[PDB]
Amino acid sequence: DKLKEAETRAEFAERSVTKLEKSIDDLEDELYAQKLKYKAISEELDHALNDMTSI
Amino acid sequence: DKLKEAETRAEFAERSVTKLEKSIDDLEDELYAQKLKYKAISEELDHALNDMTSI
Amino acid sequence: VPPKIPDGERVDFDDIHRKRMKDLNELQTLIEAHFENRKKEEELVSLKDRIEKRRAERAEQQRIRTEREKERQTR
Amino acid sequence: TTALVCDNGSGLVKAGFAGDDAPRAVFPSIVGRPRHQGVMVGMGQKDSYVGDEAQSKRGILTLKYPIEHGIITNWDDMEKIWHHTFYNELRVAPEEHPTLLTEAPLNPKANREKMTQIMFETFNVPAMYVAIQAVLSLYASGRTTGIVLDSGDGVTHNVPIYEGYALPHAIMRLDLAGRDLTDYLMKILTERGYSFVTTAEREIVRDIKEKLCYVALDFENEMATAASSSSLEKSYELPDGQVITIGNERFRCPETLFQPSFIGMESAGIHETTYNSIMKCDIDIRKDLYANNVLSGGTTMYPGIADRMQKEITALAPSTMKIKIIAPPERKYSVWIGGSILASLSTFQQMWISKQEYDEAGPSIVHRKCF
Amino acid sequence: TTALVCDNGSGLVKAGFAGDDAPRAVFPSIVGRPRHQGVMVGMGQKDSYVGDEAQSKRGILTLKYPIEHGIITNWDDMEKIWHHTFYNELRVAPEEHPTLLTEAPLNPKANREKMTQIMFETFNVPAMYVAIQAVLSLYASGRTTGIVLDSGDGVTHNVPIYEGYALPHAIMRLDLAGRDLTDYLMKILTERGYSFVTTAEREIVRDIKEKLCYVALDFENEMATAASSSSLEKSYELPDGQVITIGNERFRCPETLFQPSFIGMESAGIHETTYNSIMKCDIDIRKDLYANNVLSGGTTMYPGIADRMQKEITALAPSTMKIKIIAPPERKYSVWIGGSILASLSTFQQMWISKQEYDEAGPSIVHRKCF
Amino acid sequence: YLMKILTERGYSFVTTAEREIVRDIKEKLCYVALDFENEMATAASSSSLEKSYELPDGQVITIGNERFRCPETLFQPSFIGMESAGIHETTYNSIMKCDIDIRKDLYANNVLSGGTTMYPGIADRMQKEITALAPSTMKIKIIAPPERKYSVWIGGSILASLSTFQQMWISKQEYDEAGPSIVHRKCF
Ligand SMILES: Nc1ncnc2c1ncn2[C@@H]1O[C@H](COP(=O)(O)OP(=O)(O)O)[C@@H](O)[C@H]1O
Ligand SMILES: Nc1ncnc2c1ncn2[C@@H]1O[C@H](COP(=O)(O)OP(=O)(O)O)[C@@H](O)[C@H]1O
Ligand SMILES: [Mg+2]
Ligand SMILES: [Mg+2]
C-alpha cells in the first residue's frame, strides 16, 4: 500500500534530477561561450583606444 | 521498514529539485543579462559608426 | 514697462572656453573607467572556467555514481 | 545661497543647481492616472505616477502631458510636476532657493502670471525670474549675436539677437515641433501594418523616431534610392519582440520640418522661416546673423540636419554671404546650460523678482520692469 | 459594357452592376471548412462552403472571416470569396467587366497592391479601380461637403470633406466596430447564464444584437430604470427553443461605441472623435461640417443613435452652430449606392487602371496618379 | 473522456460510482506527453508504457497509450468535440490582448494553479508550446509550485489575514439595507 506509494515516489524522483543535469551543463556551456564572445569583443576596441589614448 | 529506504530518497530529491530550480533560474537570468549586455555593446558599436557616418 | 537691464561690465566667449576645455579630462576619465571596467569584469570568464571545471567533475562523479547504483540495484 | 535653474520645457523637465555643467535630474513631464480596476489589496497603489516613474508603469496608465504647445493647459498637473521636481528629484525645499523658470516667446500672459503666482504662493520661493528660452541658448554658445532656432518638443521659435539687443519685431514662432513629428511618424507607420494607438505606445513611437530617423540631405534622391535598393531598411525590436522594419519612413518623418505641408500646416519650413526672420532685420546686421546661425533644442539632434539646413539657406541667401550653422554637441541641454550661466552672473543678481515686490504689485509684476 | 461595383467590406459582401439602386447579391463573407469526420458516402460533401451556404450548414462548420479589420489576413480565402461572388452570385465572367473595389482609409499598402495583383492576374479583369469607402457614402447622400462617419463592421473611420477637397490630415480611423460589439455582447450575456462559445454561436449573438439592442438617449437614466422596473426585458427564441430574456444588456452592448473603455480600448467614443476630426479642419469650414454630419455603414443602424450622437455633439460644440445629422434610411448600402453612382459617371470613365498600364508599372501602379 | 476511451480495451465503467474509480485511475497513472506524436509511435511499438492497476475488487487492468491520451485533451480540445484552442494557446491569446508594454512581465511570470495542473510533465509541455508561439527573444518561465492543489486556499488564508483587508467585508447591516444585490456594488 504505502509501500507502493514509496516506490512510485522514489522512482519518479530520480526522473527530475537527471534530465535537469544536462540542461544545467548546456546552460553553463552556452553562458561561457557567450562570455568568451564578449571578452573577445571587449579587448579589441579597448586596445584600439589604448592606441588612440591621446592619439 | 521498506518505507524508509525509499522515503529517504523521497525527501532526498526534494533538496535536489530545489537546488536545480534555483540554480537554473539564476543561470537563465544571468545568461539573459549577458545577452542583453552583448546586444547593447554591438548596437553601441554599429550605431556609433552610423552616428559618425562622416561629418 | 520693458525690463531695462542694469549696468554690467563683462564677460563673453570665456566661460564657454573653460567649459569646453575639460573635454580632455572627460575623455581621460571615460577611458580609465572603460579600461578598469573591462579588467575587473573579464575575471568572471576565469570564474566561469572554474564553474566549468566544477560541472565537469560533478558530471563525472554523477556518471560514476549512477553506474554504481545501476550495478547495485538490478538484482 | 544657490539658485535653482528649472526649465519646464514640454516633454522633458530639466533642472539643477546653478553653476554646473549639466542638469541634475532630467525626466519626462507626464502624469498618468491608472485606468484599470485593481484587485490586489494593500499593494500601495498611488493615484498618480509622475515623472520617470510613469515611464515604467506605462502599461496600465494613461499618460497625459500637462504642457501642450509651450502654454500650460492643466494647472493642477503642472503643480504636481513642480512639486515632484523640487522634493524628490532635487530634495531641496523651495523656501531657501531662488528659481529661474523659462518660457517660450509670444506666449499668453495669463500663463506667465499664473506661473509666478504658483511659485510665490504654493511653493513660497524667495524670488523667481522668467527668461525667454532663446536668449539662454545664445548664452550657452558664448556668443553675443546670432539668430537662434530653438526647435523644442512643443514649439519651434526663432529669435534673432544682435550685440545683445533683441529684435522684438523679428521673432517667428511656429508650432511644429517634436510632438507633431511623433504623431506623423505614428501615422505613416500604418502604411506597413504597425498600428500604435494607445497613449502609452506614443512613447514607443517616440523611441523609434529618436533612434532611427534622420534628415535627408536631398529628399527626392533619397526617395528614389529607398524605392529601388534596400540598404536603408533598419530594424528595431519592440518592447515584446516582433521586430519591425522601417523603410523610407526613416527620413520622411523629420522631413516634415522643412515641408510643413505634410501634416497640413500652411507655413514654410524651418529652412525658410529663418531666412524670413533674417530679412526682417536691418540691412546692416544681416551678414553677422548669416554667419552666426545657432541651433538648439532637442529636435535639432537629427543626424544630418546641420547640413540640410545650411544647403537650404545657402540656396536662399545671396551668393556672397557666408552661411555657418553652429551645432554644438550639447544641443539638448543648451538652454539649461545657458540658464545656469545667467543665474551665476553677478550683474544679474539684482534682477530677481523679490517677494516683497510681488506683495506690493500682485502677479502682474512680471510684465513690468522686472521682465 | 457595364461595370461591376464590388464592395468587399468585412462581414457582408455587397455586389452588383453599376447603375442600379441596390446590390444584386448580399451575403456574409465567411468560409467554413467542415470539422467532423463524415460517414455517409457519396453525399457530395465539399471541402469549403462559402457565402450564404455556410450560414445554413453552420452547425457542423468552423466559420472564419477572411477580413479582420479592413485588412485581409487570409488571401486564399479572400480569393475564394471573390471567385464565388463573380461566378455564382452574379454569373458574369470577369473577363468582360471593369471592377470597382472599396478600401478603408489608412490601410496597409501591401493589402491594396495584392488586391490589384489578384484582380489582374487570377480573374483577369479589363480594368479595376480602388476607392475610399467614405467618399462613396458622401456621393450617395447627394452632397459635396460634410464629414462622414462610416461605422462598418470591421473598422470605423471618419473622413471630412469640403467642396470636394478631402482633408488628408483630419482622418480619424478607430478600430472599434460591429464585431467588437458582438464579442462584448457575447461576453456580457454570460451574466445571466447564457454561454455562447462556438464560432457558429457568434452568428446567433449577432442576430440578437441586430434585433434587440438599441442605443440609449441617456445612459445613467436607462441604467436606473432597467434596475427598478421590468418594462425593458425583451425575450428572444434561440434556434432550438429555450427563449432568453435580455435585460439591461440591450443598451449596454451598443453603448461601447460612445465609451470604448468598456472593452478596454483607450480612445474616445464615436461622439468625440467626430468633434476632434472637425476641430483639426480649418476655422472657416467648421460650420458646414457641423451642419452636414453624415452617418453611414451598418453599425449606425441602431434605433436611437441619430439622437444620442446629436445630443453629444451639441454638448461639445459651440452653442451657436447648428448640428444636423444626416441618417438616410438606406444607410447599410450607402457605400454601394455611392459606388454605383461613381461608376456610372462619364467624367470618371478615364480614371480606371487599364491593364496595359499595370503591365508597364507593376502592381505599384495603384499608389500612382491612378489612385 | 478517459472513461470513454477505456472502452477500447474492454473495460466498461458506467455507474456514477465507477466514475470515482476512473478518476482514481486518471490521478494515479495519466501523464502529459512532452511530444504527442513520438509518444503515440513509441506506445504502438514497444510495451514499456503499459502500467497496471488493481480495481477495488481484483482483476487488474493494463492502460496502454490511454495514459497520455486522456490529459492531451487539454492541449487539443477537439478530442472531446470542443471547438476552442488548448490551454497552451488560450494563454498566449490572453497575453496578446494585454497592452504591448506588459507582455514581457506576463511572459516571465506565467503561474499554474488548480488541481488539474498536477499532471506529471505539464510544466514542460506548456513551456515548449508557449515558446513555440511566443517571439524568440522573450523568456518564458512557468511557475509550478509543489503546493499547486491548495494554492487558491493558501492565497485565501493570506488575504483574510491581512489588516488592510479587514474593512472590505460585507457587514450584515449593509446587506439588510441594500439586499443581496450588495455583492455587485463597491464591496465586490
Ligand atoms: N537624439 C534625438 N534624436 C532625435 N530627436 C530627439 C532626440 N532627443 C530628443 N529628441 C526629440 O526632442 C524632444 C525633446 O526636446 P526638448 O529639447 O527636451 O524639449 P523642451 O524644449 O521641452 O525641453 C523629444 O520629444 C524627442 O522627440
Ligand atoms: N439592423 C441592424 N441593427 C444593428 N446592427 C446591424 C444591423 N444591420 C447590420 N448591423 C451590424 O453591421 C454589420 C454589417 O455592417 P456592414 O455595413 O455590412 O459592414 P461592411 O462595411 O463590411 O459592409 C453587421 O455585422 C451587424 O453587426
Ligand atoms: Mg526647450
Ligand atoms: Mg462598409
Side-chain angles (χ1 to χ4, degrees):
Chain A
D1 186 59
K2 184 67 176 179
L3 294 310
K4 223 293 181 58
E5 182 66 20
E7 318 309 319
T8 54
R9 179 67 182 272
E11 148 252 0
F12 182 57
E14 290 279 356
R15 180 64 61 84
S16 306
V17 187
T18 55
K19 194 86 271 293
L20 269 46
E21 211 286 61
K22 181 264 289 178
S23 185
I24 262 58
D25 253 326
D26 187 65
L27 260 57
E28 183 179 359
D29 280 329
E30 183 67 11
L31 198 174
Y32 185 76
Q34 295 298 312
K35 252 190 178 62
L36 234 297
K37 186 179 291 292
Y38 185 50
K39 183 177 184 296
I41 231 300
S42 181
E43 186 189 355
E44 183 67 21
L45 293 186
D46 179 67
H47 187 67
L49 264 65
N50 187 30
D51 185 62
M52 285 307 296
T53 302
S54 65
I55 240 305
Chain B
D1 316 7
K2 294 181 182 295
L3 292 86
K4 307 303 168 301
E5 63 183 5
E7 293 290 351
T8 313
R9 291 175 65 193
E11 185 175 359
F12 191 91
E14 291 293 8
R15 48 182 164 185
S16 311
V17 170
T18 300
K19 188 279 290 292
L20 293 184
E21 196 277 311
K22 184 60 66 175
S23 176
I24 188 179
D25 190 289
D26 302 324
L27 290 188
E28 183 66 20
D29 183 19
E30 293 179 352
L31 198 160
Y32 185 76
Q34 163 58 222
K35 288 178 68 72
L36 287 186
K37 184 177 179 180
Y38 190 97
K39 272 293 185 61
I41 291 292
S42 309
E43 293 287 343
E44 245 111 296
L45 165 65
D46 175 58
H47 211 151
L49 168 137
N50 290 119
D51 289 326
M52 170 268 301
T53 24
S54 69
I55 294 83
Chain C
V1 298
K4 184 177 301 180
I5 303 308
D7 183 79
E9 298 70 24
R10 267 326 105 171
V11 298
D12 289 84
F13 207 75
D14 191 60
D15 295 65
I16 169 191
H17 178 278
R18 185 176 63 82
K19 174 176 62 180
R20 296 291 299 275
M21 189 63 75
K22 62 186 51 182
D23 153 79
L24 292 173
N25 165 88
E26 187 179 9
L27 182 56
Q28 291 178 73
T29 178
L30 251 297
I31 186 60
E32 290 296 337
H34 163 261
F35 265 124
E36 69 84 23
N37 185 86
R38 182 181 63 80
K39 203 168 186 177
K40 193 274 184 183
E41 207 282 335
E42 292 176 355
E43 44 80 20
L44 246 57
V45 181
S46 62
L47 190 57
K48 291 315 119 177
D49 186 7
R50 203 284 301 165
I51 296 292
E52 190 282 331
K53 76 89 215 148
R54 201 274 304 160
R55 68 91 194 170
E57 185 176 88
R58 187 173 178 182
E60 183 66 289
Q61 186 84 350
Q62 187 63 355
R63 273 79 276 285
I64 295 185
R65 292 178 180 173
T66 193
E67 182 176 56
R68 68 183 183 181
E69 185 176 359
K70 290 177 70 70
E71 179 252 351
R72 71 183 69 189
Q73 186 275 337
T74 56
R75 302 168 186 175
Chain D
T1 167
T2 43
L4 290 177
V5 180
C6 183
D7 169 75
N8 299 315
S10 170
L12 278 83
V13 169
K14 295 158 289 179
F17 300 103
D20 326 344
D21 301 331
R24 188 173 307 278
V26 173
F27 61 95
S29 85
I30 51 192
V31 182
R33 294 87 160 81
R35 76 185 189 196
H36 290 118
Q37 293 177 335
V39 295
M40 292 295 183
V41 70
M43 293 301 293
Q45 304 141 346
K46 299 192 299 176
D47 296 334
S48 68
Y49 310 81
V50 318
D52 216 336
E53 184 176 7
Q55 277 284 108
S56 170
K57 298 186 173 185
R58 76 184 176 218
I60 43 92
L61 303 169
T62 155
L63 320 175
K64 296 182 180 180
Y65 294 72
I67 293 194
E68 278 296 322
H69 293 151
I71 87 183
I72 306 182
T73 62
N74 190 3
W75 275 111
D76 177 60
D77 293 356
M78 187 88 272
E79 175 170 351
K80 198 181 312 301
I81 283 296
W82 275 333
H83 166 83
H84 171 85
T85 306
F86 289 162
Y87 287 79
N88 303 20
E89 289 289 349
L90 302 187
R91 309 187 190 88
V92 283
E95 300 280 4
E96 305 181 354
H97 282 285
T99 321
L100 176 69
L101 293 323
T102 63
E103 180 78 3
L106 299 191
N107 261 10
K109 316 292 275 300
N111 161 40
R112 168 182 301 181
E113 300 169 355
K114 280 285 304 179
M115 173 185 305
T116 204
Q117 163 183 327
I118 288 301
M119 292 302 294
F120 270 154
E121 287 193 359
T122 293
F123 298 89
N124 216 318
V125 293
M128 52 87 61
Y129 183 66
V130 178
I132 305 307
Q133 284 199 0
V135 179
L136 283 324
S137 59
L138 196 48
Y139 269 114
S141 297
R143 315 268 176 189
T144 179
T145 82
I147 159 184
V148 24
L149 172 119
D150 180 87
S151 172
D153 176 32
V155 56
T156 287
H157 58 263
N158 178 302
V159 173
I161 288 186
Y162 180 87
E163 216 63 35
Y165 289 105
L167 275 30
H169 64 264
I171 300 179
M172 306 290 298
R173 165 177 172 180
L174 176 56
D175 290 328
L176 207 169
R179 190 97 57 81
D180 296 20
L181 299 194
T182 294
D183 290 354
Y184 183 55
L185 172 64
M186 175 193 304
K187 176 158 189 157
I188 58 174
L189 282 194
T190 201
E191 290 174 358
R192 314 187 72 97
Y194 320 122
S195 77
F196 302 104
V197 281
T198 324
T199 174
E201 288 168 336
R202 166 115 44 85
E203 317 299 329
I204 300 178
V205 177
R206 183 180 59 85
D207 188 7
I208 293 176
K209 169 180 70 90
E210 289 184 351
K211 296 181 182 295
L212 264 55
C213 295
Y214 76 96
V215 170
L217 173 60
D218 189 8
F219 187 68
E220 285 300 333
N221 299 339
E222 291 288 353
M223 284 296 298
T225 289
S228 80
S229 134
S230 297
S231 56
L232 297 193
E233 294 204 1
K234 195 77 67 57
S235 68
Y236 172 88
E237 162 181 333
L238 258 45
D240 83 310
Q242 48 184 345
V243 302
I244 75 178
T245 60
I246 304 305
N248 61 359
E249 280 85 37
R250 240 152 133 258
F251 55 89
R252 256 210 298 174
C253 160
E255 185 66 16
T256 304
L257 291 176
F258 304 107
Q259 306 181 19
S261 74
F262 277 179
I263 57 180
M265 251 194 167
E266 167 123 23
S267 67
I270 74 176
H271 76 79
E272 192 166 5
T273 196
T274 283
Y275 174 62
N276 283 350
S277 164
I278 286 174
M279 294 296 291
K280 281 183 175 184
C281 306
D282 309 304
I283 196 183
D284 343 35
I285 67 181
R286 289 178 200 178
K287 178 195 291 293
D288 306 345
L289 267 44
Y290 277 139
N292 292 10
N293 183 3
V294 182
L295 295 188
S296 140
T299 328
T300 52
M301 287 275 299
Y302 289 141
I305 185 174
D307 309 359
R308 172 68 176 280
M309 199 171 179
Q310 168 174 4
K311 160 181 176 294
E312 295 289 357
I313 295 185
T314 305
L316 297 175
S319 306
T320 305
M321 301 296 104
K322 183 178 179 180
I323 309 298
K324 179 69 68 64
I325 292 193
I326 280 80
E330 331 116 355
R331 246 170 306 188
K332 304 195 56 178
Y333 315 109
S334 189
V335 168
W336 188 86
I337 297 178
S340 160
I341 285 183
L342 172 59
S344 173
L345 282 191
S346 52
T347 314
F348 173 64
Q349 224 58 43
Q350 65 282 9
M351 298 300 291
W352 305 87
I353 306 173
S354 178
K355 195 180 183 312
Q356 52 180 349
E357 319 186 16
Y358 163 67
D359 300 320
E360 294 289 342
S364 169
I365 184 63
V366 206
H367 314 329
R368 291 172 63 90
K369 66 310 286 75
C370 27
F371 177 74
Chain E
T1 167
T2 43
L4 290 177
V5 180
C6 183
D7 169 75
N8 299 315
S10 170
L12 278 83
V13 169
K14 295 158 289 179
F17 300 103
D20 326 344
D21 301 331
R24 188 173 306 278
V26 173
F27 61 95
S29 85
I30 51 192
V31 182
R33 294 87 160 81
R35 76 185 189 196
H36 290 117
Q37 293 177 335
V39 295
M40 292 295 183
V41 70
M43 293 301 293
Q45 304 141 346
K46 299 192 299 176
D47 296 334
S48 68
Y49 310 81
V50 318
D52 215 336
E53 184 176 7
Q55 277 284 108
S56 170
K57 298 186 174 185
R58 76 184 176 218
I60 43 92
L61 303 169
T62 155
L63 320 175
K64 296 182 180 180
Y65 294 72
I67 293 194
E68 278 296 322
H69 293 151
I71 87 183
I72 306 182
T73 62
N74 190 3
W75 275 111
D76 177 60
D77 293 356
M78 187 88 272
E79 175 170 351
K80 198 181 312 301
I81 283 296
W82 275 333
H83 166 83
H84 171 85
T85 305
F86 289 162
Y87 287 79
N88 303 20
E89 289 288 349
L90 302 187
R91 309 187 190 88
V92 283
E95 300 280 4
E96 305 181 354
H97 281 285
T99 321
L100 177 69
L101 293 324
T102 63
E103 180 78 3
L106 299 191
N107 261 9
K109 316 293 275 300
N111 161 40
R112 168 182 300 181
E113 301 169 355
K114 280 285 304 179
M115 173 185 305
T116 204
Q117 163 183 327
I118 288 301
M119 292 302 294
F120 270 154
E121 287 193 359
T122 293
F123 298 89
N124 216 318
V125 293
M128 52 87 61
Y129 183 66
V130 178
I132 305 307
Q133 284 199 0
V135 179
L136 283 324
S137 59
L138 196 48
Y139 269 114
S141 297
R143 315 268 176 189
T144 179
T145 82
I147 159 184
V148 25
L149 171 119
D150 180 87
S151 172
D153 176 32
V155 56
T156 287
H157 58 263
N158 178 302
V159 173
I161 288 186
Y162 179 87
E163 216 63 35
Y165 289 105
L167 275 30
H169 64 264
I171 300 179
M172 306 290 298
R173 165 177 172 180
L174 176 56
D175 290 328
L176 207 169
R179 190 97 57 81
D180 296 20
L181 299 194
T182 294
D183 290 354
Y184 183 55
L185 172 64
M186 175 193 304
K187 176 158 189 157
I188 58 174
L189 282 194
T190 201
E191 290 174 358
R192 314 187 72 97
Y194 320 122
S195 77
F196 302 104
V197 281
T198 324
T199 174
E201 288 168 336
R202 166 115 44 85
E203 317 299 329
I204 300 178
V205 177
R206 183 180 59 85
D207 188 7
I208 293 176
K209 169 180 70 90
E210 289 184 351
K211 296 181 182 295
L212 264 55
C213 295
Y214 76 96
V215 170
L217 173 60
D218 189 8
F219 187 68
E220 285 300 333
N221 299 339
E222 291 288 353
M223 284 296 298
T225 289
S228 80
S229 134
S230 297
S231 56
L232 297 193
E233 294 203 1
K234 195 77 67 57
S235 68
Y236 172 88
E237 162 181 333
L238 258 45
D240 83 310
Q242 48 184 345
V243 302
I244 75 178
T245 60
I246 304 305
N248 60 359
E249 280 85 37
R250 240 152 133 258
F251 55 89
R252 256 210 298 174
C253 160
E255 185 66 16
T256 304
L257 291 176
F258 304 107
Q259 306 181 19
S261 74
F262 277 179
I263 57 180
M265 251 194 167
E266 167 123 23
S267 67
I270 74 176
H271 76 79
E272 192 166 5
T273 196
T274 283
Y275 174 62
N276 283 349
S277 164
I278 285 174
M279 294 296 291
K280 281 183 175 184
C281 306
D282 309 304
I283 196 183
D284 343 35
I285 67 181
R286 289 178 200 178
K287 178 195 290 293
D288 306 345
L289 267 44
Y290 277 139
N292 291 10
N293 183 2
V294 182
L295 295 188
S296 140
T299 328
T300 52
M301 287 275 299
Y302 289 141
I305 186 174
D307 309 359
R308 172 68 176 280
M309 199 171 179
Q310 168 174 4
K311 160 181 176 294
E312 295 289 357
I313 295 185
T314 304
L316 297 175
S319 306
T320 305
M321 301 296 104
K322 183 178 179 180
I323 309 298
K324 179 69 68 64
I325 293 193
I326 280 80
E330 331 116 355
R331 246 170 306 188
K332 304 194 56 178
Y333 315 109
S334 189
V335 168
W336 188 86
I337 297 178
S340 160
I341 285 183
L342 172 59
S344 173
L345 282 191
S346 52
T347 314
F348 173 64
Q349 224 58 43
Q350 65 282 9
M351 298 300 291
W352 305 87
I353 306 173
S354 178
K355 195 180 183 312
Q356 52 180 349
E357 319 186 16
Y358 163 67
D359 300 320
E360 294 289 342
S364 169
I365 184 63
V366 206
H367 314 329
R368 291 171 63 89
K369 66 310 286 75
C370 27
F371 177 74
Chain F
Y1 183 55
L2 172 64
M3 174 193 304
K4 176 158 189 157
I5 58 174
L6 282 194
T7 201
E8 290 174 358
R9 314 187 72 97
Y11 320 122
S12 77
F13 302 104
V14 281
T15 324
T16 174
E18 288 168 335
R19 166 115 44 85
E20 317 299 329
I21 300 178
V22 177
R23 183 180 59 85
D24 188 7
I25 293 175
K26 169 180 70 90
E27 289 184 351
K28 296 181 182 295
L29 264 55
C30 295
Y31 76 96
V32 170
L34 173 60
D35 189 8
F36 187 68
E37 285 300 333
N38 299 339
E39 291 288 353
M40 284 297 298
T42 289
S45 80
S46 134
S47 297
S48 56
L49 297 193
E50 294 203 1
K51 195 77 67 57
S52 68
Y53 172 88
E54 162 181 333
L55 258 45
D57 83 310
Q59 48 184 345
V60 302
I61 75 178
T62 60
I63 304 305
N65 61 359
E66 280 85 37
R67 240 152 133 258
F68 55 89
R69 256 210 298 174
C70 160
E72 185 66 16
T73 304
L74 291 176
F75 304 107
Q76 306 181 19
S78 74
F79 277 179
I80 57 180
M82 251 194 167
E83 167 123 23
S84 67
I87 74 176
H88 76 79
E89 192 166 5
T90 196
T91 283
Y92 174 62
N93 283 349
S94 164
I95 285 174
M96 294 296 291
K97 281 183 175 184
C98 306
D99 309 304
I100 196 183
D101 343 35
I102 67 181
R103 289 178 200 178
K104 178 195 291 293
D105 306 345
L106 267 44
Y107 277 139
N109 292 10
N110 183 2
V111 182
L112 295 188
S113 140
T116 328
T117 52
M118 287 275 299
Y119 289 141
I122 185 174
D124 309 359
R125 172 68 176 280
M126 199 171 179
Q127 168 174 4
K128 160 181 176 294
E129 295 289 357
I130 295 185
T131 304
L133 297 175
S136 306
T137 305
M138 301 296 104
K139 183 170 71 175
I140 309 298
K141 179 69 68 64
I142 293 193
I143 280 80
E147 331 116 355
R148 246 170 306 188
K149 304 195 56 178
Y150 315 109
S151 189
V152 168
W153 188 86
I154 297 178
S157 160
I158 285 183
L159 172 59
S161 173
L162 282 191
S163 52
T164 314
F165 173 64
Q166 224 58 43
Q167 65 282 9
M168 298 300 291
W169 305 87
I170 306 173
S171 178
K172 195 180 183 312
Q173 52 180 349
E174 319 186 16
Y175 163 66
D176 300 320
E177 294 289 342
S181 169
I182 184 63
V183 206
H184 314 329
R185 291 172 63 89
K186 66 310 286 75
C187 27
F188 177 74

